[PDB]
Amino acid sequence: AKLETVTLGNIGKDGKQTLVLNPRGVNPTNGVASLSQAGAVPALEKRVTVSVSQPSRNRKNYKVQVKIQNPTACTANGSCDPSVTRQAYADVTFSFTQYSTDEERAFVRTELAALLASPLLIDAIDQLNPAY
Amino acid sequence: AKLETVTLGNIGKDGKQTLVLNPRGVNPTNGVASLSQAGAVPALEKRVTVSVSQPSRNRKNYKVQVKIQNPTACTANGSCDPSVTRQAYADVTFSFTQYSTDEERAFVRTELAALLASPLLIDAIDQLNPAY
Amino acid sequence: AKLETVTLGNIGKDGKQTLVLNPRGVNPTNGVASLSQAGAVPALEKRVTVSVSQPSRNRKNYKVQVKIQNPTACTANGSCDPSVTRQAYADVTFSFTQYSTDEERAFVRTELAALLASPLLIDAIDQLNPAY
Amino acid sequence: AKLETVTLGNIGKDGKQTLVLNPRGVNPTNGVASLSQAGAVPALEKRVTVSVSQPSRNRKNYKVQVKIQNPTACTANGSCDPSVTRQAYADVTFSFTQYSTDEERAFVRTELAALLASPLLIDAIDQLNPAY
Amino acid sequence: AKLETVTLGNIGKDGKQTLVLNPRGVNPTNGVASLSQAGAVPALEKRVTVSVSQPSRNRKNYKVQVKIQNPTACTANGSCDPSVTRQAYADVTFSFTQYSTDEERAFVRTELAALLASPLLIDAIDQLNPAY
Amino acid sequence: AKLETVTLGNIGKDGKQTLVLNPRGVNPTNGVASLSQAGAVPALEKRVTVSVSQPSRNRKNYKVQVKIQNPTACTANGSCDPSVTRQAYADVTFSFTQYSTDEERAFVRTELAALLASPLLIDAIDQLNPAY
């Protein structure tokens, strides 16, 4: 949704950390807005991208795609321009019919939050553990 | 990580609960967990599909994926059987390297909940709003 | 203007009804602001959009444009979902010059509203009966 | 819509201008109705015209157009004869199906008048920002 | 960055103040802010515009572009209408890598302000004195 | 214009650094003034240059172009002579009317120094923040 500064709080393993995302403008060729960690160096700024578009004159379906891109740096090592290794992503899409109501959309999204917050997935992602 | 009955909810758009997903029917030929309301009516119900993958020589990385299915059923005139008409879906893929920490994964996980709860996404689908 | 949940009132045949148009972002490929009916049915939503460029791009004007779509819909008996059977449209274009006065522009805007109120257009539109 | 002298009020930024335009008949070669200003010089007059199209061969709907024109002129450079200088005008069209609802024909007309009063359009033509 | 009304003192030979440029939106197709003192008759108005570009195929750098638009108009010197006859402007481009720190981006920013305030540019720009 | 030793105090993101630039002169191939950072060659490379173009016989349009570059030196372990990364730079041009006054030009020169000095550019440049 609208670009502005976005604060993500109550995050990390303890659920106590915060991250502030500065907005970045929209690339009209794909309709993608971007936000990133409000740090000094882009090479290591965690990124969030939006996306979010109306049903097309082909197959309809309201669709979104939301990405998380999280880089890390090491010693450098020996470089004055530190190398970057991506450690992790998320790529979340949604698809809704043109007749979909607010509650269908809200439940798919808040179910995802409720589900990721379930120990089944908390542990599966923190561990990279299949559920059994 | 561990299969358990999932009684998710509290925050639909109206502050209502959505349940219950029974983690039963795990697919043994791809190792994919199956969470569902489908136990009552498999043709017309809500499901969550959960998979985790370990690295091999053809990828050398880790994957976590959750698929959310929320079909809506209706009985058309002349039918004695409701069928799915309107539908809503979501699909999230996460990916990690072998040097990825649990702390970074927790950030990707918790940042996503923060994003799902944040106006950045509770507008993007609910108000059908692109980033303006 | 800034997209807002715009409420119109004193509208329709008796001049007594209302309509709420919610922000749906702007189209990023042409910078056109868009609102649509608040009710959650994208398939059949009423739409209003606004374009306000200046002469640089086309070395001309640029005329201000407002687009209106009213996709009148009806549910066939026995259908689970309504569809558009008739549509009404409007395209309102106003002149602009980089050297024009804001008062001149207001004169035309308000003149149009006064004309829409005038019986000459009430018949040109309600009957589809052009002036004679 | 019989042409009659129109005496409009509520015109301009503060709604304090009025405008009176007298019938000049209808041009039967294109079906265009016209109301004139009492000024002597055609190039210097304010005027309104009306035209409605119809379904026909290669035409699917009725198109209702009103032309609003308000030239601005002055005795530039000391001229004994004033001239335009500025063209403040609007091309406003509506279109309807032959099976359309009269209530809806009224709504698009009245919705536009309501939209014209609303910040959404008053700034769009009198003084608006790109979009936003 | 986030738009605000900008109140700039110390402008011109005597340090005349205050020049006030209000946030009068952002062009959605290219991220361009438009600041202005009034905007009623744009040709005759003073403006500053700003955008930030991201790297893409073609260029690996991040860019910040600021443009200053200050046309000078003549009053209605018998013409009965003011117009632009002379103009000054600036087109200011900054470019940075993914490894640039904020500290460094700021040197280019503050060095330029410090240089603009220095005799080398006071003479190069105000008297158009040649290099020597 | 005329070259002198230039000291730029109160620079960088905290406004605390002082830079001393030693003029070298004007390169006769293109008439471009140059100021070098007053140390080792890799530091000297962090040059500021000025091109003052008098209105051309075939264009008129005076132009003053200021180029700022700041390559960052880095020596690898086992190396001596550092390589540099052109992490940050700018290219700024002032123009154009041959009939403009020193005040019109000073207005633009100082307007930019005042903008570079303002929160919008402090953030637009130091953290690459968009017009949000």
Residue numbers in the entry:
A (entry chain M), B (entry chain C), C (entry chain D), D (entry chain N), E (entry chain E), F (entry chain O): 1 to 132
Paper text:
The coat proteins (CPs) of single-stranded RNA bacteriophages (ssRNA phages) directly assemble around the genomic RNA (gRNA) to form a near-icosahedral capsid with a single maturation protein (Mat) that binds the gRNA and interacts with the retractile pilus during infection of the host. The canonical ssRNA phage Qβ has a genomic RNA (gRNA) of 4217 nucleotides, from the 5′ to the 3′ end, encoding the maturation protein (Mat); the major coat protein (CP); the minor capsid protein A1, which is a read-through extension caused by a leaky stop codon for the major CP; and the β-subunit of the RNA-dependent RNA replicase (Rep). Through a native infection without engineering the amino acid sequences, we found that Qβ CP can form diverse VLP capsids, including the T = 3 icosahedral, T = 4 icosahedral, prolate, oblate, and a small prolate form elongated along the 3-fold axis.
A 3D reconstruction of these particles reveals that they are a prolate form with T = 3 and Q = 4, where T and Q describe the triangulation number of the two caps and the elongated faces, respectively. The elongated faces of the small prolate consist of two triangulation numbers, Q1 = 2 and Q2 = 3. Figure 3A shows the five forms of the VLPs from the wild-type Qβ, each containing 240, 210, 180, 150, and 132 CP copies for the T = 4, prolate, T = 3, oblate, and small prolate forms, respectively. Though all of the 5 forms contain 12 copies of the pentamers, they consist of 30, 25, 20, 15, and 12 copies of the hexamers for the T = 4, prolate, T = 3, oblate, and small prolate forms, respectively. For the prolate VLP, there are three types of hexamers. The “normal arched” type, which comes from the prolate, oblate, small prolate, and regular T = 3 capsids, has a θ angle of ~155°. Interestingly, the hexamer located on the equator of the prolate capsid has an arch angle of ~180°, which is defined as a “straight” type. One can even repeatedly add hexamers in a multiplication of five in the middle of the prolate to obtain the rod-like VLP particles previously engineered.
